[PDB]
Amino acid sequence: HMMLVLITYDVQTSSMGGTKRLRKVAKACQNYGQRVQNSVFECIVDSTQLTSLKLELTSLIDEEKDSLRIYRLNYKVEHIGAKP
Amino acid sequence: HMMLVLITYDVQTSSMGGTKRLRKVAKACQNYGQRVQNSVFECIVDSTQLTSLKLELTSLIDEEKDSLRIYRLNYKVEHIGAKP
């Protein structure tokens, strides 16, 4: 019952506050997984971990300016361009 | 044989060139699907369309500065925060 979960975080980093929110979101997601691009994370989590992480993420983002999408994927992925 | 495909584009928009590359990538992906966040796209494509789109995307990005990931998902997704 472990799941691959993809988290995509849309935040304006032109501001120092949006910069800090990304750093906080990255730190939260990296407890459960990997930062694969600047604001994209791949976490392998069970249901309890996903509930905990979603709750934490909800407290970290600006729900009026940012958005976060969570994709639930026993799971193909291609990478083109620079390695991060 | 239609597939849901998620495309995540990592580009520095602080520069006008990176700004333009995002606009070009968005226009390419929007021929096959939807811009769901600033640099995230959901496209429903067959194999031929995916080959064409991947080839086009390869010509549009800066392969030394940007990165693009392509996730192949008969396919759950949650959205938190602002609606784009």
From Swiss-Prot, chains A, B:
Assigned protein family: Belongs to the CRISPR-associated endoribonuclease Cas2 protein family.
Gene Ontology MF term list: DNA endonuclease activity; magnesium ion binding; protein homodimerization activity; RNA endonuclease activity
Keyword hit for Repeat: no
Keywords assigned by UniProt, alphabetized: Antiviral defense, Endonuclease, Hydrolase, Magnesium, Metal-binding, Nuclease
Summary of the function given for this chain in its UniProt record: CRISPR (clustered regularly interspaced short palindromic repeat), is an adaptive immune system that provides protection against mobile genetic elements (viruses, transposable elements and conjugative plasmids). CRISPR clusters contain sequences complementary to antecedent mobile elements and target invading nucleic acids. CRISPR clusters are transcribed and processed into CRISPR RNA (crRNA). Involved in the integration of spacer DNA into the CRISPR cassette. Functions as a dsDNA-specific endonuclease, acting on circular and linear DNA; has no activity on ssRNA or ssDNA.
Organism from which the protein derives: Halalkalibacterium halodurans (strain ATCC BAA-125 / DSM 18197 / FERM 7344 / JCM 9153 / C-125)
Cofactor note: Binds 1 Mg(2+) per homodimer, shared between the Asp-10 pair; divalent cations support activity in decreasing order, Mg(2+) >> Mn(2+) > Fe(2+) > Ni(2+) > Ca(2+).
InterPro entries: CRISPR_associated_Cas2 (IPR021127), Virulence_VapD/CRISPR_Cas2 (IPR019199)
Regulation (activators, inhibitors): Inhibited by EDTA and Zn(2+). Activated by high concentrations of monovalent cation with a preference for K(+) over Na(+).
One Pfam family, short name: CRISPR_Cas2
Subunit structure, interactors included: Homodimer, forms a heterotetramer with a Cas1 homodimer.
EC number(s) given by UniProt: 3.1.-.-
Main EC class the enzyme belongs to: hydrolase
Disulphide bridges: none
pH dependence remark: Optimum pH is 7-10.
Gene name of the encoded protein: cas2
Binding site for Mg(2+): 10
Protein name (database record): CRISPR-associated endonuclease Cas2
Upper classification of the organism: Bacteria, Bacillati, Bacillota, Bacilli, Bacillales
GO biological process: defense response to virus; maintenance of CRISPR repeat elements
Cofactor: Mg(2+); Mn(2+); Fe(2+); Ni(2+)
